[model samples]
Target chain A: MEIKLEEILKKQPLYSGKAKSIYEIDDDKVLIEFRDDITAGNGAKHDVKQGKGYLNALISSKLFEALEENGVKTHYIKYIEPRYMIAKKVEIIPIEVIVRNIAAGSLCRRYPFEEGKELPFPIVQFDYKNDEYGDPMLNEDIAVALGLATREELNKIKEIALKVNEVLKKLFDEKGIILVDFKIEIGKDREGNLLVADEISPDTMRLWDKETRDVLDKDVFRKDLGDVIAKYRIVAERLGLL
Target chain B: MEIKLEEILKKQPLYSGKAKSIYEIDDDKVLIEFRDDITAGNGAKHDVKQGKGYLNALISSKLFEALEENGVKTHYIKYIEPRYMIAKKVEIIPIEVIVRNIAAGSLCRRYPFEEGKELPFPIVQFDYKNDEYGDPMLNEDIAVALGLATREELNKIKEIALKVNEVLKKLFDEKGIILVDFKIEIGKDREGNLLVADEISPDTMRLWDKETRDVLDKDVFRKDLGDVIAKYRIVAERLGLL
Candidate 1:
C-alpha cells in the first residue's frame, strides 16, 4: 500500500526542512511531508532519501504504539488513514528529554575515561530549547532560569523519562537489540497536563546491536553506511511488524 | 606555611561563582583565586573545600601541562606562587567543550533512553554563551550564529577535545579511577590558536571508583552525602598530589 500523503491531507506549510515539509492541520495535528533529500546538517550534504517520511512515520507509530500499550500517555491521536498522522497540538514545554543507557559519543567526550563503559543506571538530561541554542543541556537551575519547568515539574519530567526508558528498554531488548539512546519532547495540553509529543523516529535515536553491536539507527547513515531503510525495516520486522 | 589569598592577590570582590574568583592582575595576566565555594545553581548549596587552592592550582597546572605536553596549544601559564595563579588573558571562546565518558546527566536529558549504556565513541558538544539562554547545546550552525567558532575551528576543537580526553583518561585510568565526565573551556591565543582554558577540578568532573564505582565527584555533595572535601582529597591523593 502506497501512502499518497498530499492527496489525503490539507498541506498548510508550517515549516520546510531539508528532509521534510511540515504542515499545520485543523487545531490538533501536524502533517510532515518527508522529502527525498537524505542528508545531515540541513542537507549540507546531498543524498537520496530512502523512505524518510514513511520510515519516520512508521517508527513513530510503532514507538507510540508501544508507549500507549504500556500505559504511557502520549500525544498521538489515532493515525488517520494512510501517512497523515493525527497528533495533539501540544503547547510544547520547549524541552527535549534525552535518556542514555550506554556511554558513547558525546558521553565519552564529556567524561573521557568512562567511554564504552556501561552505566549502572540510565541518565536523563533536559535541554531548554532547540534551534536558538541547539538544545544545550540544562540543569535544574538552568531549566528554572527560563520559567519553562518548575523544580517539581522537572522532577516529574525525569520520572517520566526514566519510566519511558524502563518500558522502551524492555520492549527493545525483547527484540534482541539494545535501546541505546533516544530523544523525546514533552508538552503541555490545554488542560495544563503534560503529554509526550513529537515523533520518535530512527533519526532521533541511536539503536544498536545487542551482541555484535551493529548500528541500527541514523548513526549508520551519519557514518556513511547505505542500509538505513533496510535497517529500519529490520528493526520493525524484529518488532513483529511484518 | 599558611597561604593568605587576599594578601598574595588583588582587591577582594565577590567573583562570579563558577568554581573560581576573577581578580584583575595587570593587563597581561589574570589572577584566578580558587574559592572554597563549591556550589552550583548560583551558590545556593555550599560544599566545604578539600584541597582548595592547592587542588585548583594542581588540577589546572596538570591539565594545562597535559595540553601543552600533547602539543595542543592553550592559554595557560605557570603557577605563580603559593595559593596564587596567573594565566594569559585571552578572549575565551565563549563555549564549553563538554567531553563525556559516560552518559550520566545532561546528554541523558537531551537524548533520553539507553540510559547507563556505553557510547561507542566520544561526542564533542559545543554550548553557546548567554547564560540567559541557559547555555544551550550548539551545533555548527548555532556556533556560527554566536560567532564564537567557525566550522574549521569547531572541527579543531573536537580534535583537541578528543586528544585531551585521551590524555586525561589515561592519567585517571592509571590512578585506578574512571574519568566519568569533565568540562573544558578553550580559548584563542594571541596568535589565534585555540588553547584549553579554565580550571579542571572535581567540580566539573564525575570521578568514580574504578572497582566499587563509588561516587567521588561533586555529585556526592550535590546529592547530599557530604564529605565533599574529603572526596576531593581522596581524588587528589589518587592523582598523586601532595
Candidate 2:
C-alpha cells in the first residue's frame, strides 16, 4: 500500500520490452516505465528521442483515465509523473487487438483498400504476439487452435476492442483529432476479468489532425517525416495534457 | 438440355488456370476441364504426368457427388469420361475457403503446430485468392472490407466448409485415407444461392495413407517424394474407381 516509487524504480524490471520496462511493484501491481526507445518493423529500426517517454506517459495516463471514466475497465491504477504508471498486475495475453477506422499502413499494402479512405465501420483484428512469427494476422479459429485464447475470450476481446475504439474515437474527435486506428493488449486480472492492458499512446496508435491531415502519431517516426516528438507533443497539447 | 461437352471442349476456354480450364457452355452451366498440368508454389513448379487429369476429374466428381448426397449444394452437374465436368456456372468468390482436420503444410510452417498433429476439431480458414498478394490469410473483417463477400456469406462459407470436411473426412477414412486438409471455393448462382464450387481433388487436398502415413496428395510432387500420378492412382484404386 505504500508508494515505494523511488526505491522500486532502482531495482531490475520484471520485463524489459522494446519501448518500456515493467517493474513488479507488488504481488498485485506493476510499475511501467515508458522508455524513450522507439522501434518499428519488429524492432529492425530503433532510436531514442528526448522527452518521448514523458509525452507518451502523459498521454497514455490521460487516455486511460478517460477510458475508465467512460465505463471501460483497465489496469490503470495511478500515474507516477514523467514516465511511470502503476497498474494492476495481469497475465498479458499474447494477442494485439487492433481496431481500425480508416484504411492505413499494412492494410493498404496487404489488400486493395485505397489509402486514407474511411472504412465502412471499425474493423477488429487479432494478431499473434510472436516476434519470431512477425505477429501474423489471426482469425478466430486459428487463434483458438493455437491455444492463444479460448473462443469465448477471443470474442470478449473483440468486443472490448471495438468499445475502446468507440470511446477513444469520440474522445480524439472532440479534440479535433482523428483516431485512425489503435492496437491494445487485453489481459485477465486475478478474478479473470478481461481488462484493457498495455500502453495506449502515440506509440501504439495512428493519430491524424482533422483539418490539416497532419500525422500526429508514431508514423511520423516510422516514416521519417521530420521531428516525431514534436508530433507527440502536438497530440498532448490537443488533448489539454501539455 | 442436350450435353454439349464435345463442342465446349473444342472452343477456347473462358479461363485457363495452372491445373484446370473452364469453358462457357451456357448461361446456366459451364464445363470444367481437369488438365494434366500441375503446379505448386503458385505455378513456380510445373510438371505434367500422364493420367493426372483423368484421376483428378474422377476424384473431384466423386467428392462433389458425396457432398450432394450429404445435403450440401455444389456446382457439380455431371462428370464426363476421363477429365471434364459439367457444372452450374456461378460467380466464384475470390476467397480460398480451407478446412483442416489435422495440422500440416502451411499451418506447420506458419505456426507452432506439430506436423501431422490432429486438431481438436475442424478449423475453417479463409485466404484471399489474390496471386498478387500471394494468397494471404484473411480474417472476416478484412475479407468483408475487401468486398470479397458479405459478413453473412462468410459465416455461411465457414459452416459449409466444416460440413464438407465432415463428409469427406469420413469418406476418406472409410477408404483408409486420412483427410488432413483441403481448400475450397464458393460461388453464387444466378438466383443468389451459395454453392461449393471448384475442384476438390488431390491437387486441392493433403491426403495421407492412414496406416503408413505415406504422402498421397500433391505433396508427392511438391516435395519430390515420388511418382505423383502413382499416388493419385492409389487414391482412385482405393475408392474402387480404378
Candidate 3:
C-alpha cells in the first residue's frame, strides 16, 4: 500500500530543524525538505524568500554529486521535488565538522587571527550540534567523553572532512570562488558506516569571489549585504545549475 | 659576584601576569613570586587578600613536589621564601593544558555537561594562552597549524597532562577533596625537554570538599563565596603543608 504525502505530513516530521525538516518515507529512507526560511544568530534573525529553498536544494544536490564523484560516500538518494530529496536514513553524529582554509567567522573572533587571513593549511574543528547551547565548540576528548563519537570515529570524521574540503575547494576554485570554510554533518548507516549527510550549499559554506572578494554565500543575508536570493542565483548559475 | 634580591628587583621583572611575576636570578634559573592579587572574568573582577600570596606559593611548592615524586618533570628547583620559588628559565609554550575529571567551570558553560558531573575518564584540552583574545580554546589541528606545537609535542603534552591528573586525583582524594579539574602550562628547556611549568596552586585548580561540596579553591574567589585565603589555608593544612 502506498502512503499518501498528506498522511505522512499529518504524522509529524521525524525532525524539524531551523531550516530543514526530515520526514519518514520508508523503513530505510527519509525525505529532507529544505525550507525557504533563513536564519542566523541561533535563529534570532529570520526571513523567507520565495525561491530560496529550491536554489539550496539544487545546489546541495550538485555538491553531493561532486563529493560522491570524488569517492566520498553521502546519504543522497534522489531529488524528489523543487525543495526536497530522498536520502538513506542514518543516525547523525551530533558533531559539526568545520573545515577552515582562511581565518573568518568565529575563528577570528575567538583567536588572534585577523579576518580574511589565509591559514597555513586547512584546519578541522568540531562543534557539538546542540542548538540550545548555541552549538558550542568541542575537542576530541569532550566528544569521546560525552559518548558522542569514539576516538576512531572522530579520526575518520576528520580524515573525511579534510578530503571533502580538498574536493570542494578545487570545485569552487574552478569557478573563481574561494572556499574559505564550510561545515558538514556526518551520520552512520545500519551497517555502522559513516557517510557525509545534511545539505551542503551556500547556506553551509563561506564563498568569496577571488578577485573582488565580494560575498557570495549566506553572509549576504547574515551580514545584511542585501539581494540574498540574487546572490544564490549567481552562485547557482556559476556552478552551471541554473 | 652573587646578585642581591634588591638588585634583582631594581632590574625590573621579566614578566608580570595576573597572579605571578618572573624575575631574572641567574643564567640558568629565575625567581617566580606569587602575588596576593586575584582576579577573574579576564581580570574584570579584582582584589587583594592578605596572605593569599604566601599560601599559594606554599601550596604550589607542595603540589610540584608531589608531581615530581610521581615522575612528572617540572621547572621547580626550590622554595626561596613563603611567596617565592627558584625555577628553571624555560621557553613557555603558548598553550594552557587543561584536564577535567569532573564537569565544571567553562566546561559546563560551553558544553552540555552539568557542573560537578563526573566524566567517564579525564578529558584533556588545550587553550591558546593569548591574553588579548581571552585565551580561546583550541583543538590540536589549530594548535599545530599555528606553530604553537607540533603533532608529536601535542601528543606528549596530552599524555603528560593525563598522567598528572591521575597523580593529583589520588592526592586530593587522600585529603578528602575532589580534584574536579586543573590547568597546567608546559614549557621546553634549553635542550628541548617538556616540563610542567608555572605554579600549580589553588589559583590554577578546582577543588571541592568530598562530602560537603563546599568551594575549596579559586572558585571561592571567582564566585565571591568569601574568604578565599582562609579556604586556601584550609586546603594547605589538609595537605599537611601548614
Candidate 4:
C-alpha cells in the first residue's frame, strides 16, 4: 500500500489550462504546475519558452503573498518547486473577472475606447468562462440567470476584484511599473467563502514601465515585441524578487 | 421662418435606419416613419414587403398606449398616419436594452442555454448600440467606462426595462402570445428623465403563439417563415387594434 515518489508526482491533473495544470494534492488541497507553454488569442498563438514557467511562478508567489498581507484571501499554500505550488482546493466559479485601469487589449477592440487611454476609474467586467463560446462577455443579470453567481455574490466579487486591483496597483507603482489591468478567477471553499484561486503574473496582467510606457508583460509575447522572458525578468528584478 | 406642411414633410429625414426614419416635426417633436424594410443579421438579410410598415405602426401604437396606461413613460406621442407617428425629441442613449423571459435567439447562441427554455426570471442585458461592432454586449461597468451611461442611469434603465417587460408580458399573455423576449432603447428628455424611446412592434420583440408556439413576430421575416405582414396583421387583430 505504498506509493513511490515518482508515482505520486505523476498523478493526473484535475484541470489543465493553456499554461497551468492543477493536480489534487489531497482532499483539501491541490498542486498547480506552471508549464513553459504560453498562448494568446485563445490558443491560436502558442510557444514554449525555457524558464518562462519558473519566472511566472516566482512572480505569482510574490503577488499572492503581497495580496494576502493586504487583507485579500487567496488559495496559495506554499511553493513546492520552481514551477509548482501547493494551494487550497476550492470549487471555482466559471467567470473570468477583469479589472482595467487603462484601455488596452480586447477592451479597446470590443468598444469604442482607444488603446492606451486612461480610464477615469477602474472598470470591472466579467466573462463567462466557456471556451466553446469564446468566453463571451456577460452582465450581472445574465450571470445570475445562467446560474453562474447570485447578485449578492457578484457584488462581493466586484468589491474584492477592485480591492485586488488597488493593492496590486500600489505595489507595482512603487516598483516603477504601471499595473494597467489584470484578470483573476475566484473559487469558493467548502464553507462557501470566496477566495482568489489563480496565479497572478505576467500572464494575467498588463504591466508597463511607468516612465517609458514600454511593455513588460504578456504583450511582449502577444504583440511580438520581442524577448518575452527578458521583459518578465525585468519586472521580477524591479520587484526585487529576481 | 415659416414652413408649409408640404415643405416640412418633404424635408430629408434627420436619421434613417433599416426599417424606420426620423424627421424633425417641431422643436420638441419628431415624426417616425416606419418603412416596409425588414432585416436581420445586422442588415445582411433584408427585404421590402408591401403593407408591412402599416401593420407594425398599428401594433406599436397599441402597445405604446397600453404601456403608457401601465405607468411607463415612452417617447410615443400619437399616431399621425398609418405608417407615421409623432414622438418626443429626446436624446437616445447608444445602448440596446434587452429583457429575456425565455431562452432564444442570441441568448441561446451566445451561451449554453437551450432554445425555448423558460427562465425563472427576466434577464436584462445591454449591448453597445454601435453597428460597426455588431452591437457588442456590455456590462454596467463597461457602459459607464465608455460614457454610454452612468451607473445611476443604468440602474434607472434596468428598473424601467423590467417594468416594460412586466406590462408587456401580461398584455401579450392575455392575447394568448408568449412574450419570449424584447429589445428597447432608452433616451433622456430635456429634464434628464429616462424613457422607453424605441418602437415596440414585432421588429423589437419575439412573440410566439402560446398554444402552438408558432412564430408571430419579426422572426417570420428573419427566419423566412413566410407572410411576415400577415403574421403582424394577426397580432394587431389579437390586440383588437386592427
Which candidate has the top score in lDDT?
Answer: 2
Q: Highest TM-score among the candidates is held by which one?
A: 2
> What is the C-alpha lDDT profile of model 2 across B1-242, one tens digit per residue?
67867777899999998999999988889999998999988889998888999999999999999999999999999999899999999999999999999999888888788999999889888999998878888999999988899999999999999999999999999999999999999999989999999999999999999999999999999899999999999999998887
User: Can you give the TM-score per candidate against the true fold?
Assistant: 0.51, 0.98, 0.93, 0.96
**Which residue runs does candidate 1 get wrong by more than 4 Å?**
A1-242, B1-8, B12-17, B47-50, B80-82
lDDT score at residue A240, model 1, on the 0-100 scale: 74
Tell me what TM-score chain B of candidate 3 gets against the true chain B.
Answer: 0.96
lDDT tens digits by residue: candidate 1, B1-242: 43344664647643544667666555655677676667765466775564666666776676678778878776667675434466776677878888877767676665442445555556566776556555656655336533567779888888888898898888888988888778888876566767777777777777887988887788887887767777777887887765
Q: Candidates' DockQ values?
A: 0.05, 0.83, 0.77, 0.82
The CA lDDT of each predicted structure is 0.70, 0.92, 0.90, 0.90
CAPRI quality level assigned to candidate 1 from its DockQ score: incorrect
Instruction: State, as a TM-score between 0 and 1, how close model 3 is to the true structure.
Output: 0.93
Residue B219 miss distance in model 2 (angstroms): 0.8
Deviation of model 4 at A218, angstroms: 1.3
lDDT tens digits, residues A1-242, model 3? 33355566676799999899999988878888899999987888999998889999999999999999999999998775588877889999999999999999998888777799999999998999987778888998899987899999999999999999999999999998999999999999878889999999999999998889889899999999989899888889889997
Tell me the TM-score of chain B in each candidate.
0.87, 0.98, 0.96, 0.96
Each model's total of backbone clashes: 46, 0, 0, 0
lDDT for B222 in candidate 4 is 79
After superposition, which runs of candidate 2 have C-alpha atoms over 4 Å from their true positions? none
